[PDB]
Scaffold this active site. Structure first.
Site, PDB file in Angstrom:
ATOM      1  N   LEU A   1      50.257-122.025-104.341  1.00 52.52           N
ATOM      2  CA  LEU A   1      51.576-121.595-104.064  1.00 52.52           C
ATOM      3  C   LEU A   1      51.006-119.244-103.826  1.00 52.52           C
ATOM      4  CD1 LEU A   1      52.149-123.780-105.414  1.00 52.52           C
ATOM      5  CD2 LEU A   1      54.447-122.686-105.432  1.00 52.52           C
ATOM      6  N   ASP A   2      52.590-118.723-104.092  1.00 52.64           N
ATOM      7  CA  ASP A   2      52.769-117.433-104.147  1.00 52.64           C
ATOM      8  C   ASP A   2      53.450-117.380-105.198  1.00 52.64           C
ATOM      9  OD1 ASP A   2      50.515-116.538-101.946  1.00 52.64           O
ATOM     10  OD2 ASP A   2      52.076-115.802-100.564  1.00 52.64           O
ATOM     11  N   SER A   3      53.621-115.793-106.014  1.00 54.68           N
ATOM     12  CA  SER A   3      55.102-115.717-106.983  1.00 54.68           C
ATOM     13  C   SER A   3      55.642-115.652-105.840  1.00 54.68           C
ATOM     14  CB  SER A   3      54.436-114.567-107.471  1.00 54.68           C
ATOM     15  OG  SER A   3      54.571-113.854-106.380  1.00 54.68           O
TER      16      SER A   3
END
Lengths: 170, 63, 124, 176, 88, 152, 99, 459, 51, 606
Positions: free
Chosen positions: E42-44
């Site tokens: 995931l990204d932030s």
């Protein structure tokens, strides 16, 4: 209550004269006839029982009449004795000059309420009776402070008469 | 708060019930005297001018 | 957009909050240490046993004392303050002085004729 | 609620926060849900484009005028939940949450009821008073001589020991 | 009158329920202690997408500084619960 | 409480400023007192005019309901700026224009009434015609004085 | 240091006499004083005082007003006089100055 | 008016002649019983006033006060028990044997046939007051009130004295119900103008203005409570019994000469009432609210109309109770927290759920409430003023609006909100204090029913 | 009996009595215009006094 | 002359029973709401008999019950007025209140204190009937402000949430203004007619009674919140929803507007305030309606909708057609006190969620409320026979037929199109627009403590206006002539307000981002009235109280002028008193001055 309260003929009551088709029972008399046997009939018996005990231990009272006790114009300046009587004679009329005004008030409202939307030309008799009163009231007791003592009313009545005999000079 | 109202409600009843019950009984039996006119000179006894019974009793013992 | 003293602007605007420079950044660190040492005391003193009374809150006291009994010694007589207190003190006191007077003194000249008909009034 | 907000120490969460609120100021425009679901993926690209730039000037000088436009696009009445700041029932059930110290004024005829819940209470408060000086001593000897002090958020070391300041959070009243 | 309280199981069986609808991660091989950034990809920004469903699932919108911390889905079960005062 | 823990009087001698902010437990630079012009604002801070709404409403404070901790000293006029009286909360519309549409609405609103009062939306008919002259007797009159002249 | 005794910290007196009413620490002075507070004051002075809030007739001669007033009209109104004539102190028995 | 005082004398030995753990009890009980003996004088069957003695007297104006004072005594005597819980038995007696004197001296004043006996007790009320605030105050600033409360009360008193001297030189006797009768019409001279000051002025120090009222907050802030009740209840609103009596000799000038004192009120009546929003000291807050109301009473006497005087007597007594009440309401918290602060204990009603219903019944009576008397007084005072001038309402209305803020605002910042969790020292309620608020209101609830009693000379 | 730890309770009502006497010694001190007032001026039956 | 008096008092004895038993150590044994609600059921039963007496005979008694005080030609007596105004509202404001407690047991249970709550409603419910029933203008005033005070205390109920304390206090701020022009009036009449009660007050038909009569508008605008004082009501929706139903739609907003109909023969003989009835009353029909569109919180949207309906009542007084108003007073309760009553059923079923954005299939999940809500809102606007015709018709017949003004018709008619355009919104986004609400389904319904009252308002909202249309004595002579496009106006115009709102809320379906014009942001908030005033007046009219009245004047000037200027005057003259070195070479040279003076003193007198 005495016959001084303008209790003008108490019912001009109408009459029950129905005319509906296949006529119904009216909830008023279908229920008020159910009222004068159930709560009036008890309560009428109770006071009917209260009364008979009152006449057992009946007691009387009276009104405490009073006298003239000369007013201020006969009364001397400085002499506290005379004036004090006449003074508490005047405040003794300051109520009775004023509980009257409570009665007309009391009479000036009940008129139009027993006349509704007629309201005028059938309460003018009571209303003309009112201005008649209020005019002397103000001409008696208007400018006064709350230290109203008969020396002030007497002066109020005496400033006034001068105009009554100053304006009669031209 | 509850203890209190239980006490406030009580010590007033302690004298309110002797009174309110008592004052219902006086009016039931007696009281509420009637007008009358002077018997052509009688010298009323100072409480022949006031209506309520207990009030024209206090005025006897006092005042 | 146009900020006003009332209805001030959000903080996402007003270009602080962005200049993360070691002269601006140190402030938001040192206040925060100044702040944590202090709240940690209140935490250390809130749930302290044997704290039986309340907690002092001296800063709250420094505001009242500053406001009530620490004003007059901090006075200086100045214009903007001697002129301002008279117009707040005597100004309205002298405005109405013409109003009620002329209210009466115009009411009085009428009563001495009857042009201002005394209606059904008794209040005095 | 349970953490502290320090200085917003970097551009990242400033943006995730901006994305958070700015997103919420779209559903009030997009009442219907299918309508909403579309515009987010476009605005998603409005960040996923120019994702990584490293130009700190332009990062701010995109992120600065991002609100010089959004402010003149946001919704005046956003959708905040119940229990949310500014919203209905943010404080409704706060007229009942009594602070639990006051419980120790009930006398018998009020705690003669249920001799168990107070049999608990004394074995709770025994833990408290008997865990204080050990607890505070940790904060004392905590290496905080100078400089940074965020809150120091200290735990219990692996011992027969109880953590630091806990009466605040734990034993607080419930909600409803 | 209604709205029966949860049992941290109608959360856990309902948080993981939600994450399986995301379709960009979580191909029915995640778990409850499965971090986001390091072992799911995931990204932030992809994390703010997650918390909103949970916010949209209860209605108590998470503050700014708590989505920053919540990465594992257990931690989401671990913060929902400490607040709503579960396990009576 | 201590004498030299309570406030003072306009801290001249800029060495003294440290004994105000560290007295009030504050960063020195951030502490600039009032301009001293007149009133008894002494060595108290200025502390920019934050209404206590913009403060992040999360984060339990030492003083709930009030958005302050055990210290972080108090705005002088913390009677108005609590969340009971005032809110300077930043508004999605700007003051000068926001204050304009309202007074711009009303002043346009009032002007239509005067415009409308000129051209009342009357119904093209006559007035009523009452039974008698103008009834003189229930409207309120004096039926010992003259009768009245008017009639249909 | 100046050597005055320290502050006495709080007392928390609901520990003995949890029935403490407010008057004195010892159990049996509260009860035999409050009962004096209530009965001597709260019961009788209100009850027997309010026994005069209804009694003490004709307070400043108002009940007597209606009688004479209702009398004064039915005598004055029946015979032909106008009520409330115009004034007090008739123009007789009053010597106004001349000019 | 002797069967009252002479028992109240016999209380003064009773405290010195009682045992330690029996002394508040006895002295408290009979003081109530003094009230009944202080009530027999309600037998006012006629307007013929009850001139008992050649020095003592009665009125419908005093008999409220005379009743009232004997009612404040058990009350105020009760509210200062937990206060001074620890002290010598002497102080625990002397504080009684000094405080009672207010009962005895004020009775003599409010019953007085004269102005000297009023005067030489208009300042003998001072010894039992200044002795208290300077002694049992809890502050470093207790003393300056004992200076301000002392001198303003005297600096006006001495012209007041000198005028009573002068009146005697012209007439001889200097007494009531004679000067009322042997009253001469004044020449409105400048020398005679200064007399109107001197005979009004000291009373206008008691009833504070927009001017001299600095002694009133410094006093109440520092009195424990019994220097706040009486100083609010019957030591203040004492001028009226002075200011109504003395005003009768000199009415033909006080039309044109009284516009300032009238007007200086109707500004300050709004300012003090508007100060009373943005304040911190609770115990100060009430002190202004009394100055707000009583500023209307100064706008009563100078107009001489009956509803204006009635507008005061339904207001003085309506204010003394609710004023003396609200200090207790504060004293239900200062004894627990030990700070005069409107903010420290804000989220109550979780802990004092009932006492709130004594705040709440009171603050409403602080403002004008219809089935009450603080309105009936504040109403008639408006009515007379509308006759005096139809634009006072532009000034009165600005208060009754504001009065709807601070009276309720006391409820908000003291009984509504998140509780200050950090005050373990909240004893829920002493039944001692909790029945005070009864002994204030249940008078009102009854006195509101038949206020034929409470009116003045006129009704 | 004992040393009379409670006797003060007799003390005050002795004053209310003494006051009602002194209040009455005031009365027979004045005792003038007993009937000479214009208001009442009523001659009594055969008996003696009024007040 | 016996039955009628004996009942109209007796209802208070029923209503004083919940309260007078509220402190007996008995309430904690029994079901005090049901007890109360049972009493309310008998009160309505008893109350019909007066109403059944009035329609048959039109008798209008003036009971007194008591003498309070004598005051210089004013015997202050309690007394009750009853004529077409305190005979129908007294039953219908009582009837509806039966449909509140049943609700308020279901809504607001799981609450430690309803017995304390229900107490306060009957405190209120008594005070409003006094205001209604009061003969005097002071007995009325008891029911003026006690009504107000008791709303401060239910609006502010959860005594956290100081935002709710404010919005309670905001009302009292504007209500104690409505206090003023009332007290202006009650002062004026006394000072021109020594009565304080309506009967004698009517005899001032010819006095140019201009300003007192304008004071009543202040009284109107306080309780019946028009425009200078509108915003307290919607903000005062932070309280519980039945209270918003009971107070702020049927039993407080009626107050101000009910006052005027009891003074209807005096607003007749003036032609200036008879206008500002309209020009102010009708302003609100327009403004609040426009405000009402782009709101989202229902309880506000209903609240705003009162404020326009509130004005349209005043618009009746915009002419001399008052009796129509009272008829609209009644019917306005059988609608608004359904919707709240119907909305809490929507809300409390699910969470405390009470904005419309988060729900969209109330038709299916709740076929009951979505059947009766429509019975409200359909009948509300102009549905041709459901009591928002027998009310609304006779309104619109007059407004476009009397010589009033021009702009007032438009803003009304445009607004009478607009009672739809937010009802269409509510009845579409809530009841249609495929759902959006969090998944947990906790909808409890079928509770007979919920349907049985919701039933009756529907029975009431449908039948009663007809039942009241004919059974009443007809006055306010109805102009019915009205060519094709006048009589047919209220009908088509409400239909017109559906279609636009349908297309307007249908074009929000298509994927398109809409522009934040000032329109629908001006009206989204309030027209900016609170936002701008509530942060200048408490920043000026409150900051004009510290640095000009306390920390300037009462403390730092006045403490100088008399006291410290005097102390300083003496202590400065005191140092020069006794600051001499104790010699005699000085004192004697000081004495010898005196010696010469008393020579030079004596040597002039002679």
């Amino acid at each position: 209550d005495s016959w001084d309260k303008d209790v003008y003929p108490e019912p001009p009551s109408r009459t029950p004269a129905p005319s509906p088709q296949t006529s119904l029972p009216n909830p008023i008399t279908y229920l008020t006839k159910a009222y004068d046997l159930v709560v009036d009939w008890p309560v009428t018996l109770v006071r009917e029982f209260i009364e008979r005990q009152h006449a057992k231990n009946r007691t009387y009272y009276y009104h405490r009449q009073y006298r003239r006790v000369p007013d201020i114009t006969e009364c001397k300046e400085g002499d506290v004795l005379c004036i004090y009587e006449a003074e508490m004679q005047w405040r003794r009329d300051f109520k009775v000059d004023q509980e009257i005004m409570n009665i007309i008030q009391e009479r000036l409202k009940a008129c139009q309420q027993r006349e509704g939307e007629n309201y005028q030309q059938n309460c003018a008799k009571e209303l003309e009776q009112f201005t008649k009163v209020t005019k002397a009231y103000q001409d008696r007791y208007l400018d006064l402070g709350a230290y109203y003592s008969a020396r002030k009313c007497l002066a109020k009545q005496k400033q006034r008469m001068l105009e009554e005999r100053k304006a009669a000079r031209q | 708060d509850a203890r209190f109202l239980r006490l406030m409600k009580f010590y007033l009843m302690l004298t309110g019930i002797p009174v309110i019950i008592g004052i219902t009984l006086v009016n039931i039996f007696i009281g509420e005297a009637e007008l009358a006119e002077i018997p052509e000179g009688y010298i009323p006894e100072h409480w022949e001018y006031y209506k309520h019974p207990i009030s024209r009793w206090i005025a006897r013992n006092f005042y | 957009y146009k900020p006003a003293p009332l209805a001030t602007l959000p903080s996402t605007l007003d270009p602080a909050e962005y200049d993360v420079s070691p002269e601006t950044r140190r402030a938001q660190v040192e206040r925060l240490s100044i702040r944590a040492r202090l709240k940690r005391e209140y935490l250390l003193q809130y749930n302290d046993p044997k704290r039986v009374s309340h907690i002092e809150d001296p800063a709250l006291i420094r505001w009242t004392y500053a406001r009530s009994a620490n004003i007059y010694p901090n006075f200086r007589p100045t214009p903007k303050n001697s002129l301002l207190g008279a117009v707040a003190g005597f100004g309205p006191l002298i405005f109405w002085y013409y109003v009620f007077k002329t209210d009466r003194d115009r009411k009085e000249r009428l009563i001495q004729e009857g042009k201002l008909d005394r209606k059904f009034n008794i209040s005095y | 609620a349970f953490c502290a907000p320090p200085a917003y120490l970097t551009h990242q969460q400033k943006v995730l926060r901006l994305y958070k609120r700015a997103l919420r100021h779209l559903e009030s425009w997009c009442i219907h849900r299918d309508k909403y679901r579309y515009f987010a993926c476009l605005m998603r690209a409005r960040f996923e484009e120019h994702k990584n730039e490293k130009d700190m000037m332009r990062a701010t000088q995109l992120l600065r005028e991002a609100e010089e436009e959004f402010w003149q696009n946001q919704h005046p009445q956003p959708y905040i939940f119940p229990d949310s700041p500014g919203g209905t029932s943010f404080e409704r059930y706060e007229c009942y949450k009594v602070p639990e110290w006051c419980l120790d004024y009930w006398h018998p005829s009020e705690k003669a009821m249920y001799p168990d819940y107070f049999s608990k209470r004394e074995q709770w408060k025994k833990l408290r008073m008997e865990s204080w000086d050990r607890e505070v001593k940790q904060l004392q000897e905590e290496t905080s001589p100078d400089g940074i002090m965020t809150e120091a958020l200290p735990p219990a070391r692996r011992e027969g020991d109880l953590p630091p300041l806990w009466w605040h959070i734990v034993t607080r009243p419930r909600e409803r | 009158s209604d709205a029966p309280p949860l049992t941290l199981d109608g959360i856990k069986d309902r948080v993981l329920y939600v994450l399986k609808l995301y379709d960009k991660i979580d191909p029915e091989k995640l778990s409850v202690n499965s971090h986001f950034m390091k072992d799911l990809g995931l990204d932030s920004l992809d994390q703010v997408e997650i918390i909103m469903a949970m916010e949209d699932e209860f209605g108590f919108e998470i503050p700014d500084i708590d989505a920053e911390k919540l990465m594992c889905p257990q931690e989401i079960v671990d913060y929902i619960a400490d607040k709503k005062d579960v396990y009576e | 409480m201590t004498k030299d823990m309570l406030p003072g009087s306009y801290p001249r001698t800029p060495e003294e400023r440290a004994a105000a902010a560290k007295k009030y437990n504050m960063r020195v630079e951030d502490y600039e007192p009032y301009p001293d012009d007149g009133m008894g604002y002494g060595d108290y801070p200025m502390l920019p005019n934050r209404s206590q709404h913009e403060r992040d409403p999360w984060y339990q404070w030492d003083h709930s309901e009030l958005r302050m901790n055990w210290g972080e000293p108090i705005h002088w006029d913390l009677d108005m700026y609590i969340r009971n009286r005032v809110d300077t909360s930043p508004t999605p519309v700007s003051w000068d224009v926001m204050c304009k549409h309202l007074f711009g609405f009303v002043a346009f609103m009032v002007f239509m009434f005067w415009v409308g009062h000129v051209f009342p939306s009357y119904q093209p008919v006559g007035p009523k015609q009452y039974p008698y002259n103008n009834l003189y007797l229930e409207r309120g009159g004096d039926p010992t004085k003259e009768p009245e002249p008017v009639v249909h | 240091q100046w050597q005055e005794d320290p502050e006495p910290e709080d007392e928390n007196v609901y520990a003995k006499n949890p029935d403490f009413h407010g008057y004195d620490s010892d159990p049996v002075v509260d009860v035999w004083n409050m009962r004096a507070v209530f009965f001597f004051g709260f019961s009788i002075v209100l009850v027997f005082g309010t026994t005069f809030v209804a009694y003490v007739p004709d307070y400043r001669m108002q009940e007597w007003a209606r009688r004479e007033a209702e009398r004064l009209v039915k005598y004055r109104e029946v015979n032909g006089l106008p009520i409330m004539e115009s004034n007090y102190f008739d123009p007789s028995k009053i010597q106004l100055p001349e000019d | 008016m002797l069967k009252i005082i002479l028992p109240s004398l016999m209380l003064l030995p009773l405290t010195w002649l009682s045992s330690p753990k029996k002394t508040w009890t006895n002295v408290t009980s009979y003081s109530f019983l003094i009230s009944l003996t202080s009530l027999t004088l309600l037998w006012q069957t006629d307007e013929n006033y009850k001139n008992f003695s050649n020095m003592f007297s009665s009125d419908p104006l005093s008999t409220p006060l005379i009743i009232l004072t004997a009612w404040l005594l058990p009350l105020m005597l009760m509210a200062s028990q937990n206060h001074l819980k620890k002290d010598n038995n002497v102080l625990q007696k002397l504080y009684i044997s000094m405080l009672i004197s207010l009962q005895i001296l004020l009775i003599m004043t409010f019953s007085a046939t004269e102005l000297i006996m009023f005067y030489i007790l208009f300042e003998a009320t001072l010894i039992p007051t200044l002795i208290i605030i300077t002694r049992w105050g809890n502050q470093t600033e207790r003393l300056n009130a004992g200076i301000y409360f002392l001198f303003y009360t005297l600096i006006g008193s001495i012209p007041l004295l000198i005028a009573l001297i002068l009146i005697q030189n012209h007439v001889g006797t200097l007494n009531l119900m004679i000067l009322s009768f042997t009253t001469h019409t004044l020449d409105a001279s400048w020398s005679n103008n200064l007399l109107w000051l001197a005979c009004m002025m000291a009373f206008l120090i008691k009833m504070p203005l927009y001017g001299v009222h600095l002694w009133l907050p410094k006093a109440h802030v520092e009195a424990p409570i019994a220097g706040s009740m009486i100083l609010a209840a019957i030591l203040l609103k004492l001028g009226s019994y002075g200011m109504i009596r003395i005003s009768i000799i000199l009415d033909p000038l006080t039309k044109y000469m009284a516009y300032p004192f009238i007007l200086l009120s109707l500004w300050g009546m709004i300012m003090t009432s508007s100060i009373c929003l943005r304040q911190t000291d609770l115990k100060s807050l009430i002190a202004y609210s009394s100055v707000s109301h009583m500023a209307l009473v100064i706008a009563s006497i100078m107009i001489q109309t009956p509803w204006s005087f009635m507008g005061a007597t339904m207001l003085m007594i309506a204010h003394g109770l609710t004023s003396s009440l609200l200090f207790c309401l504060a004293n239900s918290n200062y004894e627990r927290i030990h700070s005069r602060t409107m903010i420290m204990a804000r989220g109550l009603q979780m802990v004092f759920p009932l006492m709130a219903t004594w705040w709440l019944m009171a603050s409403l009576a602080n403002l004008a409430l219809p089935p009450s008397i603080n309105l009936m007084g504040e109403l008639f005072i408006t009515m007379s003023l509308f006759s005096w001038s139809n634009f006072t309402i532009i000034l009165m209305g600005i208060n009754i609006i504001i009065t709807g803020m601070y009276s309720m605002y006391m409820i908000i910042t003291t009984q509504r909100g998140k509780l200050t969790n950090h005050m373990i020292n909240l004893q829920p309620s002493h039944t001692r204090e909790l029945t005070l608020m009864a002994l204030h209101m249940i008078p009102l609830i009854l006195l509101t029913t038949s206020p034929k009693l409470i009116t003045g000379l006129t009704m | 009996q004992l040393l009379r730890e409670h006797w003060v309770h007799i003390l005050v009502p002795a004053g209310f009595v003494f006051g009602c006497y002194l209040d009455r010694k005031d009365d027979e001190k004045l005792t003038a215009f007993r009937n000479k007032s214009m208001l009442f001026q009523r001659e009594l039956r055969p008996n003696e006094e009024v007040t | 002359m016996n039955i009628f008096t004996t009942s109209i008092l007796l209802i208070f004895i029923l209503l004083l029973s919940p309260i007078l038993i509220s402190m007996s150590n008995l309430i904690k044994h029994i079901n005090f709401p049901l007890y109360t609600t049972t009493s309310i059921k008998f009160s309505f039963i008893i109350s019909l008999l007066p109403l059944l007496m009035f329609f048959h005979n039109n008798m209008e008694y003036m009971i007194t019950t008591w003498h309070w005080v004598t005051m210089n030609s004013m015997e202050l007596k309690m007394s009750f007025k009853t004529d077409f105004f305190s005979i129908l509202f007294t039953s219908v404001a009582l009837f509806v209140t039966w449909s509140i407690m049943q609700f308020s047991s279901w809504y607001m249970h799981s609450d430690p204190n309803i017995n304390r709550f229900i107490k306060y409603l009957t405190l209120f419910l008594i005070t409003m009937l006094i205001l209604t029933s009061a003969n005097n203008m002071f007995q009325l005033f008891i029911g003026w402000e006690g009504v107000g005070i008791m709303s401060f205390l239910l609006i502010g109920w959860w005594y956290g949430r100081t935002d709710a304390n404010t919005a309670a206090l905001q009302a009292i701020l504007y209500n104690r203004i409505g206090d003023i022009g009332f007290i202006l009036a009650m002062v004026w009449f006394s000072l021109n007619m020594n009565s304080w009660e309506l009967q004698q007050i009517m005899f001032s038909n010819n006095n140019d009674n201009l300003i007192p009569l304008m004071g009543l508008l202040i009284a109107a605008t306080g309780k019946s919140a028009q425009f200078g004082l509108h915003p307290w009501l919607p903000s005062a929706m932070e309280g519980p929803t039945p209270v918003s139903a009971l107070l702020h739609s049927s039993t407080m907003v009626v107050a101000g507007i009910f006052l005027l109909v009891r003074f209807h023969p005096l607003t007749t003989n003036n032609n200036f305030i008879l206008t500002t009835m309209l020009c102010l009353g009708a302003l609100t029909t327009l403004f609040t309606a426009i405000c009402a569109l782009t709101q989202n919180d229902i309880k506000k949207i209903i609240a705003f909708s009162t404020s326009s309906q509130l004005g349209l009542m005043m618009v009746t007084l915009g002419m001399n057609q008052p009796h129509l108003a009272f008829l609209h007073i009644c019917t306005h309760a059988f609608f608004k006190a359904m919707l709240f009553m119907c909305s809490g059923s929507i809300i409390h079923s699910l969470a405390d969620e009470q904005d419309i954005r988060k729900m969209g299939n109330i038709t299916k999940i709740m076929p009951f409320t979505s059947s009766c809500l429509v019975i409200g809102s359909l009948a509300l606007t102009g549905m041709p026979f459901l009591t928002g015709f027998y009310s609304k018709d006779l309104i619109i017949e007059a407004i476009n037929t009397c010589n009033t003004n021009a702009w007032a018709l438009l803003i009304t008619l445009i607004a009478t199109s607009m009672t739809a355009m937010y009802s269409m919104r509510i009845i579409y986004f809530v009841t249609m627009t495929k759902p959006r609400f969090p998944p947990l389904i906790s909808i409890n319904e079928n509770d007979p403590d919920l349907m049985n009252p919701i039933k009756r308002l529907a029975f009431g909202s449908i039948f009663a206006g007809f039942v009241i249309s004919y059974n009443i004595p007809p006055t306010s002579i109805p102009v019915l002539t009205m060519p094709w496009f006048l009589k047919t106006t209220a009908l088509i115009i409400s239909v017109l307000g559906f279609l636009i709102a349908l297309e307007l809320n249908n074009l929000t379906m298509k994927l398109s981002m809409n522009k934040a014009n000032p329109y629908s942001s001006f009206s989204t908030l309030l027209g900016f009235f609170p936002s701008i005033i509530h942060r200048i007046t408490p920043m000026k009219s409150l900051n004009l109280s510290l640095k000009t009245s306390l920390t300037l004047l009462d403390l730092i000037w006045l403490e100088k002028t008399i006291p410290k200027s005097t102390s300083t005057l003496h202590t400065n003259m005191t140092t020069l008193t006794t600051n001499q070195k104790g010699l005699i070479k000085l004192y004697f040279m000081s004495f010898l001055i005196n010696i010469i003076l008393i020579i030079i003193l004596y040597s002039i007198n002679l």
